[PDB]
Symmetry: C2
Subunit: 137 residues, 2 copies
């Protein structure tokens, strides 16, 4: 059964940007998003949402294959408040399909918000603490 | 002036044609070269046309920003070179904004001129409450 209620991904789309390319960057990280877009004049807010229990599978895989479980876990923990876990990733690196937590993204990070009633279990499943691949928690 | 050169980065989520549009909104008649740097492309435009600064001349006056423009030209000035940085997204809609936290980097305009004092005085005369004092 599901480990989260919903995933919401948010990014700003600037006038010199392509809304389609920003949608692609978001889907690279969380597949199957349903988009709404909101006009703010100086940019558009793109919001992606999914309640699909398999929505975190791409992150699960990228954290492991990039070998960034330690950084991923630190970022999840920093973003953990109440019933939400929020991370911010590099927009341009997401467009080429990887995760980068460097907060200095040509303009605007992509923000990923995970709404969950079991955040300790989510974080331990998504970004386990390991030593040479061996569980240390 | 002898030349106007204009530079901007094009990031992967950007459309090069939109960045070109923004540059041309500010300095018409530019010829471009593009340089791939991987994480972004560098776009560089150029023109020697003597009407190359009329849009800026006009926009500085129309937007009533003669004070900020002169201050930015002076800050950017030495010798035969005046460099200013303008907001890319505002340039895309056709205006000048000298606020430098520009989404996806600024557009950098270089004016090359043998007579930069005459240049600054003509383009953005010193003003008091908007009223030119020279």
């Amino acid at each position: 059964m599901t480990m989260f209620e919903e995933v919401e991904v948010e990014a700003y789309v600037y006038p010199t940007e392509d809304i389609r390319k920003v949608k692609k960057a978001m889907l690279n990280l969380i597949p199957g998003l349903q988009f709404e877009a909101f006009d703010k004049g100086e940019y558009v807010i793109l919001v992606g949402r999914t309640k699909d229990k398999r929505a975190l599978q791409r992150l699960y895989e990228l954290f492991r294959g990039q070998q960034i479980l330690d950084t991923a876990r630190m970022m999840l923990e920093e973003g953990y408040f109440g019933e939400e876990i929020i991370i911010k990733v590099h927009k341009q690196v997401a467009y080429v399909g990887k995760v980068n937590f460097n907060e200095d993204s040509p303009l605007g990070p992509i923000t990923i918000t995970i709404r969950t009633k079991e955040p300790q279990k989510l974080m331990k499943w998504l970004a386990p603490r390991t030593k040479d691949g061996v569980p240390i928690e």
